[PDB]
Structure 1
């Protein structure tokens, strides 16, 4: 059996705060915290793939590289987190006497903290309150609403936004020069369009294009990965004629091997996030789409149900 090369996602993970791209203000604040060293308790939130945990790891590394092994406790969802296995370990780490430089503190990184139990957070409240002189906490979650109110009170909230096309493009070009691979601008814009702000998705798609075809062009990119189904569903719902929506549905979803339940859930999400049409129209569409969703969930998943849902969308849109 042959060994595998390191994926481009983890090979080109940033090790310093200057290589990470995106929210310039947040990264500049992180670098000023780096210089000062008095890092407060922080919560980092955003949609996946925009550089949340890598920024925390880079900050910890630059803060205490010599003591990353000693005075950094990286607990996470893969590790067992509960009431006792958290309170005992974190209390032992926070009370542990370790000699830092005067501006450095031990860092307890709670990666993927949105899945934590509420009682664990309640104990963490007093842990942070008591041992803030020696240890500092750094949460990182996708959804910041799961963390209880007092923890968000005793923390510095750092919100991460999805990257614009310019930053993902800059990182893609940097990785392309590092890897020395041929590309076309059309393929790069296709990769950016498919990524939708997710840098990890962009890296995965670029690596797949390079390893499957060799030339990063639009044709190869669309060969390996399809256009996202939210966009095709959005243009299916917004089409004028019923025949146009019916044929879009059939060709681009039914003949592409997309499950009916996936199509209905995507339609619900798009209609919830749709903006150009009026609110009451969206509410009526959501009501009838949910009726179709109930029909699908009860077992009747066919093309006829989706066609009927589209017909009801058009009967609502044309105003009787």
Structure 2
């Protein structure tokens, strides 16, 4: 069959990863040099952490990749016994590698690892660092215990810029010979919200549905991120405007009340314009409405009353 473009066009070399130019350049330097230290790679979903670690391991180990890499993720058994036996035996293995090259243990989604396993990892890292190096990949670097962080170089991946997403989208379009327009690519990038995976999925969906990637065609399938709609609803200077946004853009589109209130809390946490007193009062009202929704009264009237209270506070 035909693979989805998200997996079909997964970068296979470090030079095809867009964004985080400084970090990717440093990874390329490490690959060409060899002296890879223990590292932690943190960042939001779909920005290239897994791809970056895999590409770096491949470039470092060459043909020895099969015998020199041990990959484990949240879908595998990773308990304390695994650390005691499998990882320990891999780190004990004597493998002849070119100078400056070490075995690599990739621990994808390391944040989910249990406390006992993480504590056990300390001793193996202490003992087998001369021949083995650890690459953790996670979304929250703080979920790795401090004794493990103390041994690793930290690398934080930032959200991808519109320029990098556009460049990769153009490369994919050229490879696939896809017909498009500037407004269509703008809409895809705007709906991706910095997630390259979502951008590729939306591009593929639009192409399959209609082929030509225009703004109207993109917005027929893809929806604008509802956090922005919630921000617009909260920032409306008129009660009727907020109510109209809540009705037309969220309620009648099938968005659940619980999702609306959770997104409202998340957005209100990041409103830079408002004062602290107003912000905390809005948070209180959102929390009370959330309590009411959890009890079973998830009605449009409750959300309208929440908006009315927020507007009252703004005055």
| TM-score, normalised with respect to structure 2 | 0.99
Q: Kindly state the Cα deviation for residue 65 of structure 1 after the two structures are TM-superposed.
A: 2.3
1:103-143 deviations in whole A, cap 9, x for unaligned?
A: 21100000000001112111111111110111110000011
Q: Distance in 1 between matches of 2:223 and 2:190?
A: 11
Q: Report if aligned partners of 2:185, 2:213 keep a CA contact under 8 Å in 1.
A: yes
Unaligned regions of 5+ residues in structure 2, if any? none
Over the residues paired in the alignment, what is the CA RMSD in angstroms?
Answer: 0.7
Please tell me whether residue 51 in structure 1 is matched to residue 48 in structure 2.
yes
1:208-265 deviations in whole A, cap 9, x for unaligned?
A: 0001111100001100011111010100000011111111101111110010011010
SS at match of 2:267: helix
Q: Kindly state the Cα deviation for residue 299 of structure 1 after the two structures are TM-superposed.
A: 0.7
Which residue of 1 is the match for residue 90 of structure 2? 93
SS at match of 1:255: helix
Q: Kindly state the Cα deviation for residue 172 of structure 1 after the two structures are TM-superposed.
A: 0.6
1:80-123 deviations in whole A, cap 9, x for unaligned?
A: 11111222111000001111111211000000000011121111
Q: Distance in 2 between matches of 1:194 and 1:201?
A: 8
Q: Kindly state the Cα deviation for residue 273 of structure 1 after the two structures are TM-superposed.
A: 1.4
1:128-163 deviations in whole A, cap 9, x for unaligned?
A: 111011111000001111000011110010111001
Q: Distance in 1 between matches of 2:84 and 2:51?
A: 25
Q: Report if aligned partners of 2:41, 2:155 keep a CA contact under 8 Å in 1.
A: yes
Q: Kindly state the Cα deviation for residue 301 of structure 1 after the two structures are TM-superposed.
A: 0.7
SS at match of 1:108: strand
Q: Report if aligned partners of 2:179, 2:213 keep a CA contact under 8 Å in 1.
A: yes
SS at match of 2:104: strand
Q: Distance in 2 between matches of 1:276 and 1:186?
A: 30
Q: Report if aligned partners of 2:105, 2:134 keep a CA contact under 8 Å in 1.
A: yes
Q: Distance in 1 between matches of 2:53 and 2:84?
A: 22
Range that drifts further, 80-89 or 40-49: 80-89
Q: Distance in 1 between matches of 2:31 and 2:250?
A: 49
Q: Distance in 1 between matches of 2:313 and 2:22?
A: 46
Greater fraction helix: 2
Q: Distance in 1 between matches of 2:10 and 2:59?
A: 15
Deviation beyond 4 Å, 4+ runs, structure 1: none
Q: Distance in 2 between matches of 1:21 and 1:304?
A: 46
SS at match of 2:64: coil
| TM-score, normalised with respect to structure 1 | 0.97
1:293-313 deviations in whole A, cap 9, x for unaligned?
A: 000001111010000000001
SS at match of 1:70: helix
Which residue of 1 is the match for residue 23 of structure 2? 26
SS at match of 2:66: coil
Q: Distance in 1 between matches of 2:21 and 2:238?
A: 45
